[PDB]
Amino acid sequence: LIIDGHTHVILPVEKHIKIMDEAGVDKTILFSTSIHPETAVNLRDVKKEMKKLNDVVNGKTNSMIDVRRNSIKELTNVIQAYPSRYVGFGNVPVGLSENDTNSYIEENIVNNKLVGIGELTPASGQIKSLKPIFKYSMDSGSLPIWIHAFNPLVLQDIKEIAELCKAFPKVPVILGHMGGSNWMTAVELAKEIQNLYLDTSAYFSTFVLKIVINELPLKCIFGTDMPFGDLQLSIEAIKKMSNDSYVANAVLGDNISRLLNI
Amino acid sequence: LIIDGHTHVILPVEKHIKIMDEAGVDKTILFSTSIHPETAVNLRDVKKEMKKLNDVVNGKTNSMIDVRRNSIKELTNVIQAYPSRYVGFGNVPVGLSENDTNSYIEENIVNNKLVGIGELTPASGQIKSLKPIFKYSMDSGSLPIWIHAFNPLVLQDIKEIAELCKAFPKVPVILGHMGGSNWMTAVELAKEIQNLYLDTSAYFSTFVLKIVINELPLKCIFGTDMPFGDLQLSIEAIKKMSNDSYVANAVLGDNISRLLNI
Ligand SMILES: [Zn+2]
Ligand SMILES: [Zn+2]
Ligand SMILES: [Zn+2]
Numbered sequence A, B: 001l002i003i004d005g006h007t008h009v010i011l012p013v014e015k016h017i018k019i020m021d022e023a024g025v026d027k028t029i030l031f032s033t034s035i036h037p038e039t040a041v042n043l044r045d046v047k048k049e050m051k052k053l054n055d056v057v058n059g060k061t062n063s064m065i066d067v068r069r070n071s072i073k074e075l076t077n078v079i080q081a082y083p084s085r086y087v088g089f090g091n092v093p094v095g096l097s098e099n100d101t102n103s104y105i106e107e108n109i110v111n112n113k114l115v116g117i118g119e120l121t122p123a124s125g126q127i128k129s130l131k132p133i134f135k136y137s138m139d140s141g142s143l144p145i146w147i148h149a150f151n152p153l154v155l156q157d158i159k160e161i162a163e164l165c166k167a168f169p170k171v172p173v174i175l176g177h178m179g180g181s182n183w184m185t186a187v188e189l190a191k192e193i194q195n196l197y198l199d200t201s202a203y204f205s206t207f208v209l210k211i212v213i214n215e216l217p218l219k220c221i222f223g224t225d226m227p228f229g230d231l232q233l234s235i236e237a238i239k240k241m242s243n244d245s246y247v248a249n250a251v252l253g254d255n256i257s258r259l260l261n262i
């Protein structure tokens, strides 16, 4: 009904549940994270944390295993506390072998009953390195893949993501952040490709947001990217930019409820 | 005074004055524009304008002097209609000779009584081409220079803008959009460099917005970037993210009132 389609685990968990309660939000799709800027005491510590997140988003940490496994453990432990309020996507190391990627997915995603894979943060130029994650999904239960697509991703990376969608048509793909500055191409590709959807989180223009959600009302998925975005402010923006209440309600939860079978 | 520090000319003008009125906004620093996506009815035309825009901001239109002479005439005529509500910045083509630069500025900026130069849209790697404009502003009334600093500017362009600030310490510089994904460096640079301010428009994270405005409460200038942003929405965000009402009142207008002597 309102489902936040993309938020990183927030601590203390009860503060986030209270923010959901106050915003009229039923459920959140939670994403693992190695980093908790929302708990940093003092500005120096916030910056330290934001600098580490910059490295992650830039793709410098992608082959690391243990940190992704600890963040899944955090994620499963958080969901277990509020299993009516949370569903989870778990992250998978990029740039491993097909064998090691499969076992990883089996142990850390399937065995934890997570509903999707992400948030992937490929380095620019390295989209093709995601093939084995698509392969696993093509086969075993078509888990949605969620891909960060704001900076540092450029136009050609968006195009390459599109090609993987076409090559693996049964695997749903959610494009993080509408493709950033590349939203015009992102919206064309999502119109064209059956299995490509767009996340709304981290829009930089309410006019771009208006154009994209009203052009693709059934394939845009509301998300806030907490702790980076604000739940009430983002909900308010969706409802103000939506051309009618159907569009608003589809983007705000009916689309992802349909997609994940919530 | 709440002042919108960065908005492009909106047509019809009375629509924009009404929005200001409803949002409790006293004045807007209005910036010229060659494209009007707000007057496009139907989606094909909107897309057509947004595309023309996307390559302006990317730096491809940077020598289309005719079109730009027309946009300044538009801006001067709009200002004349509500001279108590609007003050203007006028654009200057980026890559011209020192002589062709001082000629354009004299005719189009100084003669039209505009209070600043902008919004400049240098292509990535071309920040050094801006030197003539800094040189002229230094010889005229130290007119502020306002530079688009979201994509496609990268970190190195941001660093190069800072060097220009240091070479021209009396020329105020407003860094558009907090420097986008490069906001961590942008805010360090603005802390250290006397004449460098940050525009808040086109933030993509309210958390980033929060860190930046509370770290630099006296050098962040509220702007909405209409027609790309939404006045009421953006104001709400500033007030919600500000740590106190001083911070909010500075960012929302006192800062630009001081800098521009409004
Ligand atoms: Zn992301
Ligand atoms: Zn995220
Ligand atoms: Zn701009």
Ligand SMILES: [Zn+2]
Residues within 6 Å of the ligand: B006, B008, B119, B225
């Ligand atoms: Zn602008």
